[PDB]
Amino acid sequence: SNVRVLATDLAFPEGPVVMPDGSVVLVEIRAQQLTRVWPDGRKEVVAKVPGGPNGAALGPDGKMYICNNGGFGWMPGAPAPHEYIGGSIQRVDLQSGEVETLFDKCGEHPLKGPNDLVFDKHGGLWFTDLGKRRARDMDVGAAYYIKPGMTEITEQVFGTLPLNGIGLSPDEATMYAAETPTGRLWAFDLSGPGEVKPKGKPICGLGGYQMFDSLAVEASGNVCVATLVSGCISVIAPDGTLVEQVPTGDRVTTNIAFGGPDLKTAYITLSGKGELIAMDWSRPGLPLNFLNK
Ligand SMILES: [Ca+2]
Numbered sequence: 001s002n003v004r005v006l007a008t009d010l011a012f013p014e015g016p017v018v019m020p021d022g023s024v025v026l027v028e029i030r031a032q033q034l035t036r037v038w039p040d041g042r043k044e045v046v047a048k049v050p051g052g053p054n055g056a057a058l059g060p061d062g063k064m065y066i067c068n069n070g071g072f073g074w075m076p077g078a079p080a081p082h083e084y085i086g087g088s089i090q091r092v093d094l095q096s097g098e099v100e101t102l103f104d105k106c107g108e109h110p111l112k113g114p115n116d117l118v119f120d121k122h123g124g125l126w127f128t129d130l131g132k133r134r135a136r137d138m139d140v141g142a143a144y145y146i147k148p149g150m151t152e153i154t155e156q157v158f159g160t161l162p163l164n165g166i167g168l169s170p171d172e173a174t175m176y177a178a179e180t181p182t183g184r185l186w187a188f189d190l191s192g193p194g195e196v197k198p199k200g201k202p203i204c205g206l207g208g209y210q211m212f213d214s215l216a217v218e219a220s221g222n223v224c225v226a227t228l229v230s231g232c233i234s235v236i237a238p239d240g241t242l243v244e245q246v247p248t249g250d251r252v253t254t255n256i257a258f259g260g261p262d263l264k265t266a267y268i269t270l271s272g273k274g275e276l277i278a279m280d281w282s283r284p285g286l287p288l289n290f291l292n293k
């Protein structure tokens with residue numbers, strides 16, 4: 001586990017997407033932008049994304065899809081009314097910087113705080129909703145699926161505590177969602193693309209005072225979840241066994257993505273220190289659709 005710092009002075013980094021050349025496109029939630037970090041050290045702003053760009057994934061159209069949580073109040077907190085512009089799913093052209101809003105509601109219900117996302121092999125898009133905190137109450141968590149072609153958005157999970165990381169199993173027959181305040185990883189069986197069948201179960205709950213953020217799946221099927229408070233990556237087996245906890249040095253570790261040769265480098269956002277780091281990983285990551293395979 002040879003650790004290296006790839007970038008600093010990032011304004012709450014999140015949503016890393018590791019390109020084939022080892023460059024990383026990621027979101028800076030506090031600076032409201034999509035940023036490109038190159039292996040020669042240089043950084044460039046790809047696009048300004050007003051609000052709270054929170055997670056990213058490359059899509060079948062070659063554009064970068066974004067979960068926009070609508071803004072926080074800044075460490076993040078509950079957004080004062082004016083700092084919140086509504087949650088949405090957006091798309092960014094990585095060549096022009098043009099930002100287009102795709103969805104801001106599902107049925108008659110506005111999206112609250114979209115958080116992270118993952119494409120299935122048909123181009124359908126899963127995403128979590130962490131909800132928003134208000135003065136005396138908070139939204140429940142949810143997960144959504146957008147049908148291939150971006151034709152329709154559907155609610156698949158609703159009424160958990162806030163949901164954050166999301167991924168698919170290698171065979172894409174199971175969707176995983178991390179429940180932030182409880183440090184529980186939930187597994188949902190899929191009867192087919194985009195469709196949960198009964199709605200799921202927690203396969204792992206960490207002890208102590210530990211909370212979950214975003215995640216990435218390994219080719220083995222293990223789920224690697226960024227763990228807040230204790231500052232590590234929690235590696236969870238498909239059967240829920242806690243395989244290991246890899247310390248990162250930052251209590252606000254928020255996300256992980258695999259890249260490099262054989263997808264055996266982990267790229268991790270340390271959102272407390274404002275850093276993107278890389279770490280050797282003993283097992284290869286699961287290739288993401290429309291990025292790695
Ligand atoms: Ca997240």
Ligand code: NA
Nearest residue numbers: 215216256257
């Ligand atoms: Na990730």
